[PDB]
Design a protein around this ligand. Sequence first.
Ligand SMILES: CCCCCCCCCCCCCCCC(=O)O
Length: 131
Amino acid sequence: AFDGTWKVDRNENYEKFMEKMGINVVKRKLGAHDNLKLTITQEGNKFTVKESSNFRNIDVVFELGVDFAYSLADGTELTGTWTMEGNKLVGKFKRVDNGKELIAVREISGNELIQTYTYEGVEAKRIFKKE
Ligand SMILES: CCCCCCCCCCCCCCCC(=O)O
């Protein structure tokens, strides 16, 4: 369902979310203008995500329900899993530093991939368009 190449289109509440994550002024400004492009490839229960942005070009591989580690562009480490719940991909992660939970949702909406993030009562969204 998620295969393809998606480029960020719009953001809602994103700088606010980053602030709450405690990310510094500069990195927040840069983060908000990262030109994030995701190429997603699903092969059974295995997904490979090519994360391409102004920060880095990283390949992320994970299997549904198997815990993995991921580091954010500013170096903060998370551990968690992605699971399929019906048509959405639900990501439940914990910050390695303070043990607080980060929930991420990926859902498609005809031509658009919406990624919604929640942390400590703050919700933000990133919207991507199919290439
Ligand atoms: C400079 C820091 C940027 C701020 C980043 C905001 C938080 C993004 C959280 C993404 C968590 C899930 C990503 C896991 C990898 C994947 O499945 O694509």
